[PDB]
Structure 1
């Protein structure tokens, strides 16, 4: 619904390519740092996104990467978002592995959990929560990126649960078996994200293929406790992986659990 005037955007740097194509760093009206997705023709269900984009812009929280506005009067369309100078969390963890204290790792989990509790309170699903889809700003704050955009991807390798781009390693059994998305499937993904954080960016179920991961988690295999996770922290991430969705906590409960560990530490 905020239709940004493209004349107000100055492109400054190439940030790379994602599922929707080229992303650039720029400024709005010469001042505000933004990231700009240039949506590659054919990569996105565009009429569907435009019809629904206002709901996503209305999601406002300090730990969400803001979707500020769109440019849809031309092609390619633009999606204008909050710029995050330290890039995606996955690379941030891997590039600074020897600099983190365990207190900082728990704070990253708290940042993400606060954003997800807000989304949960709006009955809004992320659907592709993972360290690769969190970003880090210049002061080390972690924020959740591209919530809700998974629904608009046009790429059978990503939308099929047996495709090579589907986020199998972050998916609960009921997503892999039935495509049943809910707040509780975001909960499962959050647990895997906690594991990514405390493993300093290792790949979950490394050496397993996607289908081997699906087979074995459906039979009860679970990710081991990372060395840097205390047992209290591991209990929190493990609670996200109950086979039955209704036995998984809410993000409200997870946040309370994380704050309790902080107060104890």
Structure 2
């Protein structure tokens, strides 16, 4: 099929790590083109549902999305774009980079462009956070594994009380009522900007998940990272309005980030 990649066209070269579905490896497709290969461990994925949605994910084409090239469905494999510099979260925590804030702003812009595109397709990421962003050889950040949360069978990940749930990237109405929308992706983007300007600090670093959920339920918020200007903090803070309707769109966040870039 159009979505299906012949696994005999793959050459496995390096292990990259382990995620919710198991090992990811680096390799080549037809001897020439770098790819990342997710080897989906048995029982970790609702596979038939994912296969049908891979038809829609293939067509989600934006330069700031980590592209899904295809799937191996005859473990099943997911074949994606390769990002030489790995995960954004680990990238931010490498102090050797000595990032300027203009560089941090450009990572935010990168992610916001991917997400303005997904929102234009009415497609929700559902687990946006720095761990689900990757960095290529030119320092470009792209958004990875968008939509994949729907096919995770692990109950610790899919329940809002589970140990693996993205509590610290979740708006109040997700934590209280499981009400997901474009505005929960907005909430998580603001936490992501906070992670970037915090150089990979855990949000609510001194709190448990349970204490975070009570905190944000009482109206309390993350506060300004040392490297965020007042204008940058205003942008991320706009994402955390208690009323989902009063949060910006990604088109509006993109205009604000572009505005501020004119100041560095």
TM-aligned CA deviation for residue 19 of structure 1: 0.4
Q: CA offset at residue 264 of structure 1?
A: 3.2
The 2-side partners of 1:244 and 1:167 are apart by 20
CA contact (8 A) 2:3 2:70 kept: yes
Distance 1:64 1:98 in 2: 23
Task: Decide whether the 8 Å contact of 2:133 with 2:141 is kept in 1.
Answer: yes
Q: Secondary structure at the match of 1:227?
A: coil
| Superposition deviation, residue 112 in structure 1 | 0.1
Deviations 1:1-29 (A, max 9, x none): 42001110100001111100011000000
Residue in 2 that maps onto 1:8? 9
Report deviation, 1:96: 3.2
- Partners of 1:215 and 1:189 lie apart in 2 by 17
The alpha carbon displacement at 1:50 in A equals: 1.1
Q: Contact (CA 8 Å) 2:14, 2:26: kept in 1 or not?
A: yes
Long gaps (5+) in structure 1:
none
CA contact (8 A) 2:114 2:142 kept: yes
Q: How much has 1:165 moved relative to structure 2? A: 0.3
* Range with greater deviation from structure 2 (175-184 or 94-103): 94-103
TM-score (norm 2): 0.98
State how far apart, in whole Å, the 2-side matches of 1:127 and 1:30 are.
34
Structure 1 residues 3-152: aligned runs within 5 Å: 3-73=4-74, 76-96=75-95, 99-152=98-151
Q: Contact between 1:191 and 1:241, CA under 8 Å: does it hold in 2?
A: yes
* Structure 1 residue 97 displacement after superposition: 5.6
Task: Provide the TM-score with structure 1 as the length reference.
Answer: 0.98
- 1:97–1:200 contact (8 Å) kept in structure 2: no
**Residue by residue, what CA displacement relative to the aligned partner does 1:34-83 show, whole Å, maximum 9, x if unpaired?**
0000000000001111122111111000000001100001xx10000000
Q: Which stretch of structure 1 is more off in the superposition, 163-172 or 93-102?
A: 93-102
For 1:96-153, what per-residue CA distance to the aligned partner results, in whole angstroms no more than 9, with x for missing partners?
3651001000000000000000000000000000000000001100000000000000
> 1:134 & 1:181 partners in 2: Cα distance?
20
Q: For each residue in 1:225-260, what CA deviation from the matched residue of structure 2 results, as whole angstroms up to 9, or x when unmatched?
A: 001000000000000000010000000000000011
Whether the 8 Å contact between 1:169 and 1:213 is mirrored in structure 2 is: yes
**Local SS of the residue matching 2:179:** coil
Root-mean-square deviation over aligned CA pairs: 0.8
Runs of 5+ consecutive residues of structure 2 not aligned to the other structure = none
